Design a protein around this ligand. Structure first.
Ligand SMILES: C[C@@]1(c2cccc(NC(=O)c3ccc(Br)cn3)c2)CO[C@@](C)(C(F)(F)F)C(N)=N1
Length: 377
């Protein structure tokens, strides 16, 4: 695992990527690590924002599957062709496998100027793959073709950023304290259940199904903590109340506007900690992960504003359920234990903290109310 430590890079708010190769001879590409999708998709034609791309004509191991694929997102979209080829992760396991690849030949508002990644590694399950669930995801192919155990872990680190993706096991050097597990409720997204939410120690006091309307997921491919409208508004109310000695424009709370302080003077202490209690592996037991403002206030690097430290509010409203994105995962060691259908959280070597507060994973907590917090079945 020591060879795999620090195999992730990123620019703050642009995404964490890992080096991969595709084809024979190998073509090196930087690839976004995305637990929120299930396609391995790489740019395969020139694009103004692509510094390099997959050239299939140069790979004699490429096989054309003779099927197109169209993938729309909320913002942006791309079209491509399906095929398979040899894929490896130079700073991952010492293996090369054959995997499905979506070769992206045309796109719109997809490739981000300056992000440094040229494709996406979708690490979730076949159920949400495009065009349909018959297209085996990369990790499934990896496990089937090699002896690698069916789990990976992600240590995403804040700040230029970095981290580790450990495939096939748990690296104890990357966390301290206990590792706490929450069940994967359904294998499509990495879906989990939130049973309680506190802001500065105060329970939001909602029916816990509200926290998971209509699903909750762990998604390295999303930046923000995204919350259902009802939960979002209650969270903003509590955070505003705690930070009321300073008032910010409406646009800040919507994520449309930056707030800045003279470098080094960010008033971290007027912003509350957020605790998300996740369903435990034992009935009505839970554990909490605690999120500091150093996490949910996302710094925006810009040389022009660099006399200050400036931030975006990295909590936003969702109409498709809760998303625990990178700002939630950062500072934690997160184990995607597919083999045992559970996700583990532990305090990471690069967890956030200041002289008064620290990110934490704590348990067990017991709750008398026996309501099932799942929204659907
Ligand atoms: C495939 C998809 C996607 C597509 C294009 C870009 C991105 N991600 C980022 O650029 C980025 C930036 C900063 C940080 Br930190 C993490 N990631 C994600 C579709 O969109 C979601 C966000 C979803 F959930 F809608 F499916 C997802 N996970 N993967």
């Amino acid at each position: 695992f020591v060879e795999m430590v620090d195999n992730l890079r990123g620019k703050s708010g642009q995404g964490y990527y890992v080096e991969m190769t595709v084809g024979s001879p190998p073509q090196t590409l930087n690839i976004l690590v995305d637990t929120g999708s299930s396609n391995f998709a790489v740019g395969a034609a020139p694009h103004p924002f692509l510094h390099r791309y997959y050239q299939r004509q140069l790979s004699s191991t490429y096989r054309d599957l003779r099927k197109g694929v169209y993938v729309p997102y909320t913002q942006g979209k791309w079209e491509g062709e399906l095929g398979t080829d040899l894929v490896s992760i130079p700073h991952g396991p010492n293996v090369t496998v054959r995997a499905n690849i979506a070769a992206i030949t045309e796109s719109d508002k997809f490739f981000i100027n300056g992000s440094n990644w040229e494709g996406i590694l979708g690490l979730a399950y076949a159920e949400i793959a495009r065009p349909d669930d018959s297209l085996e995801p990369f990790f499934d192919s990896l496990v089937k073709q090699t002896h690698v155990p069916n789990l990976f872990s992600l240590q995403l680190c804040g700040a230029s950023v970095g981290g580790s993706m450990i495939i096939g096991g748990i690296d104890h050097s990357l966390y301290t304290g206990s590792l706490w597990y929450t069940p994967i409720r359904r294998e499509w997204y990495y879906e989990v259940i939130i049973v309680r939410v506190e802001i500065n120690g105060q329970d939001l006091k909602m029916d816990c199904k509200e926290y998971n309307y209509d699903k909750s997921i762990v998604d390295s491919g999303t930046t923000n903590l995204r919350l259902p409208k009802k939960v979002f508004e209650a969270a903003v109310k509590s955070i505003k109340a705690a930070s009321s000695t300073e008032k910010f424009p409406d646009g800040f709370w919507l994520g449309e506007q930056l707030v800045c302080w003279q470098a080094g003077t960010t008033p971290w202490n007027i912003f509350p900690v957020i605790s998300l209690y996740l369903m435990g592996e034992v009935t009505n037991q839970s554990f909490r992960i605690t999120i500091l403002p150093q996490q949910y206030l996302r710094p925006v690097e810009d040389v022009a504003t660099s006399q200050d430290d400036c931030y975006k509010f990295a909590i936003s409203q969702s109409s498709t359920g809760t998303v625990m994105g990178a700002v939630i995962m950062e500072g934690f060691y997160v184990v995607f234990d597919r083999a045992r259908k559970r996700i583990g959280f532990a305090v990471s070597a690069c967890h956030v903290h200041d002289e008064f507060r620290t990110a934490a994973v704590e348990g067990p907590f017991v709750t008398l109310d026996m309501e099932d917090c799942g929204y659907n079945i």
